[PDB]
Amino acid sequence: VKKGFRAAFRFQKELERQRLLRCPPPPVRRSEKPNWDYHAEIQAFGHRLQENFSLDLLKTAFVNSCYIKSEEAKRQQLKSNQELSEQGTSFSQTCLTQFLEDEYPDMPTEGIKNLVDFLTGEEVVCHVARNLAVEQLTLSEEFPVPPAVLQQTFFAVIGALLQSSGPERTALFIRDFLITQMTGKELFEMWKIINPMGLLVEELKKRNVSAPESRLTRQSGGTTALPLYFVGLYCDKKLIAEGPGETVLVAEEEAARVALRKLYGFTENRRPWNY
Amino acid sequence: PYMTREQERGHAAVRRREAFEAIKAAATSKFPPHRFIADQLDHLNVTKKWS
Amino acid sequence: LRNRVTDRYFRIQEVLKHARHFRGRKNRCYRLAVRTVIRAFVKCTKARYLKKKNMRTLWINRITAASQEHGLKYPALIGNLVKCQVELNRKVLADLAIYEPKTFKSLAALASRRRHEGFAAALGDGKEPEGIFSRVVQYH
Amino acid sequence: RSRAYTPPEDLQSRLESYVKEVFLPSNWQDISLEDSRLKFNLLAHLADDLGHVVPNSRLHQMCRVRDVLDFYNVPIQDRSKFDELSASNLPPNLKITWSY
Amino acid sequence: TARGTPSRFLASVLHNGLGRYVQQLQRLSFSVSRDGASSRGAREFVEREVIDFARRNPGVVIYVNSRPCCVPRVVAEYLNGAVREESIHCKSVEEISTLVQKLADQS
Amino acid sequence: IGIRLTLPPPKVVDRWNEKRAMFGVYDNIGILGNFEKHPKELIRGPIWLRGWKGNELQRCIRKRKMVGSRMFADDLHNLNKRIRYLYKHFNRHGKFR
Ligand SMILES: [Mg+2]
Predict the structure, then answer these.
(1) Helix or strand holding residue D30 (H, E)
(2) Does D26 touch chain A (CB under 8 A)?
(3) Is residue A201 domain-shared with residue A187, that is, in the same domain?
(4) In terms of CA atoms, which chain A residue is nearest residue F7?
């Protein structure tokens, strides 16, 4: 028994750490930990993004309808979220279609609808609102905040910024948080399609150009388990696109996708977004 | 050479002498530093507390 | 024992957090883990020199390969780009070789054009007009 | 009994009144307190009145009446640091607590 | 060493410079002993520098807890939910100021 | 693993004990009690080191000549051998001479 206290204290806390790694507790929400002042942190959320809100309106932007119902379930022993989220998602849909119709004038509106339904999807918006401290300020029933609820609160925050400071500042907000989520993503990672060849055929009918001949430009290792093909797509013996693949069908479909990126201006070499 | 050896003689004796008088002067000006009351009393602040 | 050492689990564990990924008993037995951990740190600092060296030879391999695609050799490309006052370096030329092969093709065209003006200039000797790409920009 | 001191606005006339009541000429601010009874009466009246006493660490420092005058018009303000920080007009993102 | 440690690629949090710049530091949590020799430089930091600091960036909410600690800490929390706990044990005010500005400037 | 698993019982120390509150009193009995006692007449301990400090060979010599006559037999014997050893060490071994 070695006399002293400091090594027993250090060892006591290392045992505490191995207890936390072996059996970690279920994650508690942030408002149920020390160092929380809700009002101060809503104000901080305002100043963080570099705009002003009417603070009561932003406060109602974080108050869900599930929270009021389970809260009144807890009373027996507040304005909801839905109006602001309605306004915010209506506005963000029409402004995203404004930006994406302005900077991509050749896109089909099916494509603009799938882009906008990507930039306002649950995956994108929930990825954005967990890094703007929206989730920490959401008054929700259950933790972690389920993704439909958090989508609703994010567009509620957009609605509150709209009523706060008009359509131009929210346009810059949506530009700076939702549009930057399509950086480094290809078009058909966002607008998924089946049968790009038929789509390319129909688009070439709309420009009054003939149907393209798929036409094998380069190949290698044709009789092996690792071939490479470049199928080209010619229109009146001038190619519009050419793409590679492991088989011929794969390369032909992919050349169809290259042609569709080229018709719509959504190439890898397009002029970047001007911020 | 730009000069003969007769021409160069003592053409830099002053600057050499002043340089060595500087070396000599930094050598003979070596002494313990000043000790201050403020440093010794400033050790009392290790038990400065709040009220 | 007046004062014997209490805090010795932590000295051992300062060494052994660096050895947890070795093999054999080097990962657990301090006496073995110390020799291997020291020896790992010495390699870790002498490897900074070799990181720089091996990147540079990697770039010379990639510039060599990409310039052999256009018929040039590596000394011809680097020499006759210096002589055009294009002071791009090996990292950038290797990255242009992979990612921007038209810029790399035009750099190989600029270097072979300069190389031929070097030939024609150093063949017809005497007072003559200099080459067009052979001219230098004087800085004062 | 609280160490807070706020100097009065009629302190010149009060202090002068005490100097006359312990005595009296013009240029009364340059009266030496070399007499020990005179100093005890003067500072004892002021301590009795103002509730603020010249400490032992400073008691030899006043050799003129002017020095007592210059002593009794520094505001000695006494409160806890929790009451100094929270009254120093905090921005809305500082929060200070005192687990004491 | 690099083979012992994990590695990652250079990134931002939500494309942090594209649209606008967002301060990635949400909360600081100072905990400072009232009577205690290790939190002296923390005390002089709360008295002198923390109000100026709290005004120079309002997106950061700062909690000074002031309990009887034996080692004072600062706990930086970030927008992406990272937590950096650093000690300000026996540091001068200037060293604490450079540490807190270091935590502010990073992600 | 020679480290203890539970932290030990706390060390309750009374700083305002009788001994601690009155430590150091009558250290100045000389200089402000008219020099009738020295402070070294305040210290209690072995009779051969009241107001005397020496290294170990000197402590052993002094102990032998001051109290060695009534020392026990094998203590006296151990002490004679310690003086004999410490003699042969201080006088014939070391670095500096
Ligand atoms: Mg080298």
Answers:
(1) none
(2) no
(3) no
(4) A8
